[PDB]
Design a binder for this molecule. Structure first.
Ligand code: MMC
Ligand code: MMC
Ligand SMILES: [Ca+2]
Ligand SMILES: [Cl-]
Ligand SMILES: [Hg+2]
Ligand SMILES: [Hg+2]
Length: 164
């Protein structure tokens, strides 16, 4: 498990393009004509579809679990598997405020077909929070980027283990 300080450091490094990850693009990379050239800092964990939302989580979960757990499936499929001990899936109830480093999973509305996923950067309040995510633009080309979300379509949070 990682400490909150380690988690918080890693989130800023994702957003800065400096994260210690072997899946971070070092030089602008392209292989899929349907997507934009991945900029330095984009995370591509599977070698398909350039830098999608789930690529970020694959990397993050690998890091949290010392490379023991590789995610499978699309964003929406993350709530149908377990990343292991100390990971907990919570339904988003309208009371529910997430914590920094938790994983936010969108599975309804326009997000239904593949889902969307990202990391809670600031837990916010009941109205909004700040997410760190890839590919909210659809072009699969940008590094992880922060966005204010209003909980629309957001159905679950994955609580991650945090070391004292
Ligand atoms: C490798 Hg944590
Ligand atoms: C609330 Hg699990
Ligand atoms: Ca990818
Ligand atoms: Cl997405
Ligand atoms: Hg640990
Ligand atoms: Hg939607």
């Amino acid at each position: 498990a990682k400490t909150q300080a380690e988690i918080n450091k890693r989130l800023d490094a994702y957003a800065k393009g400096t994260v210690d990850s072997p899946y971070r693009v070092k030089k602008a990379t392209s292989y899929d004509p349907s997507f934009g050239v991945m900029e330095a800092g984009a995370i591509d964990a599977d070698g398909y579809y350039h830098a999608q939302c789930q690529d970020l989580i694959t990397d993050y979960v690998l890091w949290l679990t010392d490379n023991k757990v590789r995610t499978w499936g699309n964003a929406k499929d993350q709530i149908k598997q377990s990343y292991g001990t100390g990971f907990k899936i919570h339904e988003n109830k309208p009371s529910t405020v997430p914590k920094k480093g938790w994983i936010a999973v969108f599975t309804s509305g326009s997000y239904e077909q593949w889902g969307h996923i990202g990391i809670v950067y600031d837990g916010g309040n009941t109205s909004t929070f700040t997410i760190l995510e890839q590919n909210w633009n659809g072009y699969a080309n940008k590094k992880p980027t922060k966005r204010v979300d209003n909980y629309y379509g957001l159905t679950h949070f994955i609580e991650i283990p945090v070391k004292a």
